[PDB]
Paper text:
The spike protein of the SARS-CoV-2 binds to human angiotensin-converting enzyme 2 (ACE2) through the receptor-binding domain (RBD) and changes the conformation to fuse the viral and cell membranes, mediating viral entry. Here, we used a structure-guided strategy to engineer an inhibitor peptide with mutation-tolerant and potent binding ability against all SARS-CoV-2 variants. We named the peptide CeSPIACE (COVID-19 eliminative Short-Peptide Inhibiting ACE2 binding). For engineering, we determined approximately 2 Å-resolution crystal structures of CeSPIACE or its intermediate-stage peptides complexed with the RBDs of several strains, including WT, Alpha, Delta, BA.2, BA.5, or XBB.1.5.
First, the main-chain structure of the ACE2-binding site is invariant to form the backbone of the binding site, though amino acid substitutions alter the side chain. Superimposition of the crystal structures confirmed that the RBD main chain of the binding interface was perfectly aligned, and the main-chain structures on RBD surfaces were invariant among various mutants. L3, Q7, E23, L26, and Y33 of CeSPIACE recognize the main-chain structure of RBD around A475-G476, N487, Y501-G502, Y495, and G416-N417, respectively, fitting into the groove between side chains. CeSPIACE was designed to interact with Y473, A475, N487, and Y489 via L3, L6, Q7, Y10, and M36; with R498 via G20; and with Y501 and G502 via G22, E23, and L26. M13 and V14 form a neutral and optimally sized pocket to accommodate both Q493 and cationic R493, which exist among Omicron subvariants. The longer side chain of R493 contacts the binding surface comprising M13 and V14 more extensively than Q493, resulting in retention of the binding state. Mutation mapping on the structure showed that most mutations of the Omicron subvariants were outside the CeSPIACE-binding site, but R403K, F456L, N460K, F486S/V/I/P, and R493Q were on the binding site. FSEC analyses showed that CeSPIACE can also potently bind to these binding-site mutations. The F486 mutations tended to reduce the ACE2 affinity but did not affect the CeSPIACE affinity because CeSPIACE recognizes the RBD main chain through L3 and Q7 whereas ACE2 primarily interacts with the F486 side chain. One of our intermediate peptides, Ce149, potently inhibited mutant RBDs up to the BA.2 strain by enhancing a hydrophobic interaction with F486, but its efficacy was attenuated by the F486V mutation of the BA.5 strain due to the high specificity for the F486 side chain, making it vulnerable to mutation.
Residue numbers in the entry:
A (entry chain A): 1 to 39
B (entry chain B): 334 to 371, 374 to 529
């Protein structure tokens, strides 16, 4: 399923923001967009 | 009776892109030729700003919001991306002007400016000039979310969290979109050389 790896990616985005890595959080955000834009 | 372009470009607060602001401008005269300096970066997809001073329109709409620097290229006709699809969408036949400028010193904050957000999840693309300000939990899987974020149940908006130390591609940019509407009605917005 795509749901597990999506959740893990989403959790990395959240963790990066909580630890002050905001810029890197935005780059992971872009990956979420591109991933869900697929089939 | 001059058009209030100063309240648009030089405004203190700017909206988030998901809740982009629209200011209807009418019943006034404006000098579009001075808009080459109204720091900036602008592109008109219809006639030049000089020819805009010769034309009149029923209403002029000014849309304004903040996004990342690397997302400004999405504020153009025929573009796709996170912003174009889910936040602010221009039609393929857009013939107005797009103006954007770096706003790092105003919209970034040490520790992060969490006021500005964008929509990351949506069940379909936006139609041109559609606005979506809903905050329903996006259900990515088949289990219900019951109105609370959790596994595969994501709050649909994400913050940019702008910080002064971001790379220029990730710094905030204030964007102003001018669209020119000609209805079957008195054209009450004219240029300088009209």
């Amino acid at each position: 399923d795509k749901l597990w790896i999506l959740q893990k990616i989403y959790e990395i985005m959240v963790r990066l923001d909580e630890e002050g890595h905001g810029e890197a959080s935005l780059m992971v955000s872009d990956l979420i967009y591109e991933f869900m834009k697929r089939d | 009776n001059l058009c209030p372009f100063d309240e648009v470009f030089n405004a203190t607060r700017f909206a988030s892109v998901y809740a982009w602001n629209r200011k209807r401008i009418s019943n006034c005269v404006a000098d579009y030729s001075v808009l080459y300096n109204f720091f900036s970066a602008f592109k008109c997809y219809g006639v030049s700003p000089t020819k805009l001073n010769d034309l009149c329109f029923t209403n002029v709409y000014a849309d304004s919001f903040v996004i990342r620097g690397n997302e400004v290229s999405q504020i153009a006709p025929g573009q796709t991306g996170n912003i174009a699809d889910y936040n602010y969408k221009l039609p393929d036949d857009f013939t107005g002007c797009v103006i954007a400028w770096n706003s790092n010193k105003l919209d970034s904050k040490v520790g992060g400016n969490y006021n500005y957000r964008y929509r990351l999840f949506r069940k379909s693309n936006l139609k041109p000039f559609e606005r979506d300000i809903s905050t329903e939990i996006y259900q990515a899987g088949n289990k219900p979310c019951n109105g609370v974020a959790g596994v595969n149940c994501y709050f649909p908006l994400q913050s940019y969290g702008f910080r002064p130390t971001y790379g220029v591609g990730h710094q905030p940019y204030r964007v102003v979109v001018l669209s020119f509407e000609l209805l079957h009605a008195p054209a009450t917005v004219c240029g300088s050389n009209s």
